[PDB]
Structure 1
Amino acid sequence: VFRVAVSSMISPLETMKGYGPVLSYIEQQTGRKVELVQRRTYREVNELIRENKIDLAFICTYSFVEAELFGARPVAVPQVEGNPYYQAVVITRRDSGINSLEELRNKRFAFTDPMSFSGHIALRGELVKVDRTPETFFASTFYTYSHDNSLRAVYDGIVDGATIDSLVFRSSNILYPEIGAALQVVHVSPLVGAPPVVVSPGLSEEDYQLIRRAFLNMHNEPLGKQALDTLFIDRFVMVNSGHYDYIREIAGKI
């Protein structure tokens, strides 16, 4: 059995963003039955990696900075439009009159996960530049544990702004154009490496190279092309650990 972790509340069987085809692709290329190990939080997935209780994990860029240090091996990173990188985007409603990050002072704000770069840490980094924290900058904050629920909260006026994954913003705009069309990007983070795929510290060199071959060749296999459509990405390319140095920089400055 091949244990694959995700930090996501999206079902693999979801009509719109169901990533079941990714699991089917891994089954075909490994010859192993895939077991999905789904958790709400990044912390839970990183603990499973630390304790060598899974084989393969889809983790966030901040999670990767920690996971690298307890021996998680990088497999691949998604590429969209030639770019294996992404950024945090700060989103408001176009009709809000809130047109910049400064205009979100004393407003209600949404984060995703305490360990999310694009959903939390990137914005903590922007506020260091004006010598503030979220707690002293915004009227209130909240963790949604969902980029899509953060988007829906901005759309509904529940919060005035949210920080989300540039790639989820892109995929949301394709699937749910009604949410996006009402929304504007008022601020963006610096560029960082895209969320990487890793294998556990314990997986064999044989199995690693097999999984690395499978991800880097996914765009060449018909079932792989189907899996890339469910993930809204062009292909997987090799990880460059240097592409997460901005996150290591912010981390050092809490």
Structure 2
Amino acid sequence: VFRVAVSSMISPLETMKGYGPVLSYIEQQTGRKVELVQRRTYREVNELIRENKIDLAFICTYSFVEAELFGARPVAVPQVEGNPYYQAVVITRRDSGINSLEELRNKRFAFTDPMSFSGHIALRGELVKVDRTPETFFASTFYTYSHDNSLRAVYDGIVDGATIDSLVFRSSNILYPEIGAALQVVHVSPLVGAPPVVVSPGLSEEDYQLIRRAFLNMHNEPLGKQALDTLFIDRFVMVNSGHYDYIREIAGKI
């Protein structure tokens, strides 16, 4: 059995963003039965990787910085419009009268996961530049553990702003026209490498090299093209560890 970990509450069978076809592609290319190992938090997934309880993991960019150091081996990174990179976007309602990050001082703010770059760490990085923390900048903060729920909370006026994954913002806009319609990007982070796919430290070298070829050729296989449409990406390309140097810089400054 081939164990694939995701940090996501999205079902592989979801009508809208179901990634089941990604799992079918991995079955076809590895000739293994795939077992999905789904967890709410990034920390749970990194612990599974650290303990070799899984074979393959879709992890986040901050999680990767930590996971690389305990031997997680990089497979590939998604590419959208020729770009294997993304950024944090700070989102408000167009009708909020909140048109910049400075206008979110003393407002309610949503994070996703404490270990998310686009959902937490990027924004903590921006606030270092004005010598603040989220605790002394915003009126309140919250962890949604969901880029989609952070989006919905800004939409409903539950929070005044949120920081989310630019790729989720893009995909959300394709699936839910209201998002592009009612929400605005008021601030962005620096660019970093997109969220990578890794194997466990323990996975055999033979299996690792098989998976690497499967991901880097996904755009060449009909079931692979189906999988890429469910993930809203063009293809996978090789990981460049240097593309996460900014995340490493933020981490040191806390």
Same fold (TM over 0.5): yes
**Rounded Cα–Cα distance in structure 2 between residues aligned with 1:166 and 1:12:** 21
**Rounded Cα–Cα distance in structure 2 between residues aligned with 1:49 and 1:205:** 16
Shift, 1:129, TM fit: 0.1
* Secondary structure class of the residue paired with 2:140: coil
**Rounded Cα–Cα distance in structure 1 between residues aligned with 2:112 and 2:204:** 34
Partner of 1:159: 159
**Rounded Cα–Cα distance in structure 2 between residues aligned with 1:87 and 1:179:** 18
Shift, 1:180, TM fit: 3.0
Give CA deviations for 1:172-193 in whole Å, capped at 9, x if unaligned.
Answer: 0000111331000000000000
**Rounded Cα–Cα distance in structure 2 between residues aligned with 1:221 and 1:11:** 24
Runs of 5+ consecutive residues of structure 1 not aligned to the other structure: none
Partner of 2:6: 6
Give CA deviations for 1:90-116 in whole Å, capped at 9, x if unaligned.
Answer: 000000000000000000000000000
**Rounded Cα–Cα distance in structure 2 between residues aligned with 1:250 and 1:195:** 17
Q: Normalization by structure 1: what TM-score?
A: 1.00
* Secondary structure class of the residue paired with 2:184: strand
**Rounded Cα–Cα distance in structure 2 between residues aligned with 1:238 and 1:181:** 35
* Secondary structure class of the residue paired with 1:14: coil
Partner of 2:91: 91
**Rounded Cα–Cα distance in structure 1 between residues aligned with 2:181 and 2:208:** 42
Answering whether residue 213 of structure 2 is matched by residue 213 of structure 1, we say yes
Give CA deviations for 1:176-229 in whole Å, capped at 9, x if unaligned.
Answer: 111331000000000000000000000111100100000000000000000000
Give CA deviations for 1:75-134 in whole Å, capped at 9, x if unaligned.
Answer: 000000000000000000000000000000000000000000000000000000000000
**Rounded Cα–Cα distance in structure 1 between residues aligned with 2:161 and 2:218:** 36
* Secondary structure class of the residue paired with 1:52: coil
Runs of 5+ consecutive residues of structure 2 not aligned to the other structure: none
The equivalences for 1:54-203 within 5 A come to 54-203=54-203
* Secondary structure class of the residue paired with 2:253: coil
**Rounded Cα–Cα distance in structure 2 between residues aligned with 1:33 and 1:122:** 37
Shift, 1:28, TM fit: 0.1
**Rounded Cα–Cα distance in structure 1 between residues aligned with 2:178 and 2:242:** 37
**Rounded Cα–Cα distance in structure 2 between residues aligned with 1:182 and 1:83:** 26
**Rounded Cα–Cα distance in structure 1 between residues aligned with 2:19 and 2:224:** 11
Count of equivalent residues: 254
Partner of 2:15: 15
* Secondary structure class of the residue paired with 1:252: helix
* Secondary structure class of the residue paired with 2:89: strand
* Secondary structure class of the residue paired with 1:246: helix
In angstroms, what is the RMSD of aligned CA positions? Answer: 0.4
**Rounded Cα–Cα distance in structure 1 between residues aligned with 2:104 and 2:73:** 39
Identical-pair percentage: 100
* Secondary structure class of the residue paired with 1:236: strand
Give CA deviations for 1:43-101 in whole Å, capped at 9, x if unaligned.
Answer: 00000000010000000000000000000000000000000000000000000000000
**Rounded Cα–Cα distance in structure 1 between residues aligned with 2:213 and 2:118:** 28
* Secondary structure class of the residue paired with 1:97: coil
Shift, 1:35, TM fit: 0.1
| Segments ≥4 residues shifted beyond 6 Å | none
Q: Normalization by structure 2: what TM-score?
A: 1.00
**Rounded Cα–Cα distance in structure 2 between residues aligned with 1:60 and 1:219:** 22
Give CA deviations for 1:146-188 in whole Å, capped at 9, x if unaligned.
Answer: 0000000000000000000000000000001113310000000
